């Protein structure tokens, strides 16, 4: 269960529409806080506990303080459905570069 490659598209696919609805601005926080909790010793074990994505899917969006719009809840479940919801930072680093590319042309 280590599809690190899934974070590359996640950071972009989640950014593609985040730009059309002008979410990118407030959306940056959601990914920043999400990527920060996934790389947290206690949260890391909680996420990689079993094959069931539900235990880590709702647990993640909840520990964030329910501050995630519809896409924040849809992404964490799909990310967990692929057995790699803990790869939030794997997408964050990719997303930060997408902003630089959008903030350049």
């Amino acid at each position: 269960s280590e599809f690190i490659t899934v974070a590359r598209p996640y950071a972009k696919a989640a950014f593609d529409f985040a730009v059309e609805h002008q979410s990118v601005e407030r959306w940056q926080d959601m990914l920043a806080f999400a990527a920060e909790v996934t790389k947290n010793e206690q949260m890391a074990e909680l996420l990689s506990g079993a094959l069931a994505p539900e235990t880590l899917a709702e647990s993640f969006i909840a520990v964030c303080g329910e501050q995630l719009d519809e896409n924040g809840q849809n992404l964490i479940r799909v990310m967990a459905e692929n057995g790699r919801l803990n790869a939030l930072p794997d997408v964050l680093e990719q997303f930060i570069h997408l902003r630089a590319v959008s903030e350049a042309t």
Binding site: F3, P9, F17, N82
Partner: peptide
């Protein structure tokens, strides 16, 4: 290339913004 996790981007774009809307 479209076949490995890197191509799921379009599938993600449809689910990340429209997961519970099918």
């Amino acid at each position: 290339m479209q076949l490995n996790s890197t191509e799921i981007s379009e599938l993600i774009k449809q689910r990340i913004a429209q997961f519970n809307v099918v």
